[model samples]
Target chain A: LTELEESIETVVTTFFTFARQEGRKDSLSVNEFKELVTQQLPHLLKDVGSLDEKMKSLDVNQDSELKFNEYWRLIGELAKEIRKKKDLKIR
Target chain B: PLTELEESIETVVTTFFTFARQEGRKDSLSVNEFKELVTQQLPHLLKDVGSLDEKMKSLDVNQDSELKFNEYWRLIGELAKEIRKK
Candidate 1:
């Protein structure tokens, strides 16, 4: 696989790595998601006030948990921020 | 290398650099570069979307024939979501 392809896999795999450590192998409990943020997502989420707050915002369906789709959205937000950070350096 | 998640995001960004620096521009993807990145990196996910260049045209919001980081990031998000559905 190409680097980009592997990175995509990494994003998905990281979710599973954390999610499987707790409840529901396919979804992240609030605690699992919190751990994910603390360890892997620390730098990307540096701008955010709180992981719990961010998690609440992401749990759009009010389920109090995060599915892969919800986690994917978080990755999306991080990707956007990454792009902005690099773009800022360009100009 | 960045952290696992940080590396993932930056890998995409840096992979853009790997290809983008190959020719004219240093920061954006030329149409050719875009096709290469899609063909090489997006080999699987893009199959669902149909027509690589056509997808490129759609993503090239400004139609400048070049893809900036945000434009390319949008493509990643699109394919990532598609992957979720499968």
Candidate 2:
């Protein structure tokens, strides 16, 4: 795998590892979600406003847990934010 | 203080911004910018994506002749999904 491919695999595997921590190996409970972000995405989540609020928004099904799709969407959003920050920093 | 995972995400983000900032708008990718990125940064991955022009057209949802960050992001997400399925 190229570095980019390996990086993406890291994201996918990381989710499964954390999601399997407790109930429902397919999704992340609020606590599990918090743990994942706080641990794996510290730098990205720092300025994303309230963590709980972000979690709530990402929990599209409102089941108080995050499916893989929801978690992936969160990462996509953060990636866009990072792009914007870089745009400003460069100017 | 970023973990390897965080740094990985940063690599993806930085790659997009670096290319998007190359010409025209700083917020999106032109056809030339997209070509450069795919040819240089994504040589291996994009090889399996059939035709790059078709991929770009599909990604340019609004069809404004430009690829916005959101569009570019969705492409990466789709590629990631494909990798997961493999």
Candidate 3:
């Protein structure tokens, strides 16, 4: 796999690993979401205020469960933040 | 340096801005910028994605002439998901 492909796999695999830890294997429960964020995304989410609120906002379906799409969106948001930081460094 | 995962995410972000800054606002990618990005950085993956123009159009949710960071990230997200399925 290419570097980009491998990186994508890492993110996707990380999600399943955490999502399957508790109840639903297909989605992340609140606790699972917390675990994933606090562990995998500690730095990215550190200044995000509240994990609960973050999850609520990400859970577009309002189902209290984070599906793969929602999890992907979270990563996408963080990635954007990373880009912004890079821009700041440049300017 | 960063962790493998962190570095990976950085790669995606860095790549986007690299392309976005090539022309226009530097904050977003114009159609030409998007084309150059796919043609260069995303050579292998995007080549199989059919028309680069169509792909950009689909990802440009706002129908704007440029692609915001979010839109570029979403395109990467879709590609990642596609890779996972294969």
User: Number of the top candidate by TM-score?
Assistant: 2
**What is the C-alpha DockQ of each candidate?**
0.54, 0.58, 0.43
Report the lDDT tens digits of candidate 2 across residue range A48-73. Answer: 77778888999988998888889888
* Per-residue lDDT over A1-86 for candidate 3, one digit per residue giving the tens place of the 0 to 100 score: 55565676787888888988888897999899988877777776778888899889999999999998888878877787787687
Instruction: List chain B TM-scores, each candidate.
Output: 0.85, 0.91, 0.91
Residue pairs in collision within model 2: none
Residue B51, model 3: lDDT of 80
The regions of model 1 sitting more than 4 angstroms off are: A89-91, B21-27, B44-50, B61-64
The per-residue C-alpha lDDT of model 2 at residue B81 equals 74
**Model 3 interface CAPRI class:** acceptable
lDDT digits (tens) for residues B20-65 of candidate 2: 8889988789988998888887777678777778878999999997
What's the chain B TM-score of candidate 1? 0.85
DockQ score for model 2: 0.58
True contacts kept of 2: 0.55
Q: Which stretches of candidate 2 lie over 4 Å from their true place?
A: A47-54, A89-91
Ranked by TM-score, the better of candidates 1 and 2 is 2
